[PDB]
Amino acid sequence: SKGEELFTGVVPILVELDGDVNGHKFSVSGEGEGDATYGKLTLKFICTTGKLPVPWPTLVTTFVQCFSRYPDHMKRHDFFKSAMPEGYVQERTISFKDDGNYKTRAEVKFEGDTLVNRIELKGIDFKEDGNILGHKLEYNYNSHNVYITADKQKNGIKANFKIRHNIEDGSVQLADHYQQNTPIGDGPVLLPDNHYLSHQSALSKDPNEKRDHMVLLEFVTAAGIT
Ligand SMILES: [Cl-]
């Protein structure tokens, strides 16, 4: 399998994001590696412009589902590795309940030996001291299922899901995610039957890191097909 074969071992990852939320600009760089055999990602992000102006957890879904573990019986449903090495475009609208939204566009593709995710994010209509701009989210993350369906007219997939962000008082901020992936190349890809990715993510800090940053550990496995 062409794109499959790219993921058999440990693959270096680079992530670059440029953001503007309510007119506040920022950049983040990240790096680490992914091992699709285990569905495992390990990543470290740095805000290179100073302090991140939105909470770190609100960016986790934005910051590579090609590293998901597709069990053997589900391998024909793996759109993400089938689009490689040329890659795919991943767009989202992320609507924070009773608050603003992010729109993101990313390119995920091999650039030489490294899998690269380059993102542009634009956030509008946030409240000046709502959970996002007021930094009221706990520094943590919950497990979620990403329900994938084929988008055959775009030769890709759509996904819909809701992220639960725990709030420092015990309430939860929902972030509705509407996602569209289109391959960058012209040829055929694998278009899946309905299924889901089981995502889990754990956020931590590097004690020796004085920059605003996030260390992110993920495990992602496909499921929903027996
Ligand atoms: Cl939860």
Curated annotation (Swiss-Prot):
UniProt record, GO biological process: bioluminescence; generation of precursor metabolites and energy
Effect of K158Q: In R10-3; matures to the red-emitting state with excitation and emission maxima at 555 and 585 nm, respectively
Annotated tissue distribution: Photocytes.
Consequence recorded when altering E218G: Suppresses the 399 nm excitation peak, leaving only the longer wavelength peak at 475 nm
Phenotype when changing Y141C: In mut1.9; shifts fluorescence lifetime from 3.03 to 2.74 ns
Documented effect of changing Q65M: In Citrinine; leads to excitation and emission peaks of 516 and 529 nm, respectively
InterPro entries: GFP, GFP-related, Green_fluorescent_prot
Family listed: Belongs to the GFP family.
Subunit structure: Monomer.
Protein name per Swiss-Prot or TrEMBL: Green fluorescent protein
Organism annotation: Aequorea victoria (Water jellyfish)
